[PDB]
Amino acid sequence: SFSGYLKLTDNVYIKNADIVEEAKKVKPTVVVNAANVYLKHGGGVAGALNKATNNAMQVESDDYIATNGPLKVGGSCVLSGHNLAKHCLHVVGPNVNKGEDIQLLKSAYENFNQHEVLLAPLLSAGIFGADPIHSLRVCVDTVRTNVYLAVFDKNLYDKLVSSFL
Numbered sequence: 001s002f003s004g005y006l007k008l009t010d011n012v013y014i015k016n017a018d019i020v021e022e023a024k025k026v027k028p029t030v031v032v033n034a035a036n037v038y039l040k041h042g043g044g045v046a047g048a049l050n051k052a053t054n055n056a057m058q059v060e061s062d063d064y065i066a067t068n069g070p071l072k073v074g075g076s077c078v079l080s081g082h083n084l085a086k087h088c089l090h091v092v093g094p095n096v097n098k099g100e101d102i103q104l105l106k107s108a109y110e111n112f113n114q115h116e117v118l119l120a121p122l123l124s125a126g127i128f129g130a131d132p133i134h135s136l137r138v139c140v141d142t143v144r145t146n147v148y149l150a151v152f153d154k155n156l157y158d159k160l161v162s163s164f165l
């Protein structure tokens with residue numbers, strides 16, 4: 001169902017797209033959220049995905065945290081995808097702006113290997129403060145399942161493709 005993606009490797013694909021609009025169109029089995037440990041979906045990709053669910057993602061997430069406690073940096077949980085996907089895989093990449101360890105980015109991408117196909121953003125990019133070129137390199141070298149990356153910013157998309165090794 002994914003269309004218009006540039007193939008980077010055997011299993012990694014990329015497109016300049018808004019992941020909310022992509023999720024509404026494709027209705028994938030799994031959409032990845034760029035989550036934090038508290039599942040507080042305030043801004044970035046998480047704020048956008050939650051807004052698109054009319055805050056239902058945040059209501060479900062607050063119940064999950066009340067029962068289970070916070071996730072680990074590098075960890076994940078599977079929740080509903082609401083109106084966007086069958087499931088949302090909430091993945092916590094390190095937040096460099098909070099001083100978190102960038103070596104946890106590979107552990108974060110390992111969560112994707114539990115799902116055959118995913119629609120995802122680049123982990124730890126955007127407001128999480130990591131270099132998106134590094135994030136794409138770790139993604140290609142860690143994920144073995146089929147990943148469709150949506151990059152919101154056109155200028156960043158072009159730089160990611162042009163500099164891809």
Ligand SMILES: O=C(Nc1cnc2[nH]ncc2c1)c1ccncc1Cl
Nearest residue numbers: 018019020044045048049051052152
């Ligand atoms: O907020 C939106 N997009 C958005 C914003 N900021 C982002 N950062 N990273 C991804 C992303 C996406 C939006 C646009 C159109 N329809 C629904 C929504 Cl919820």
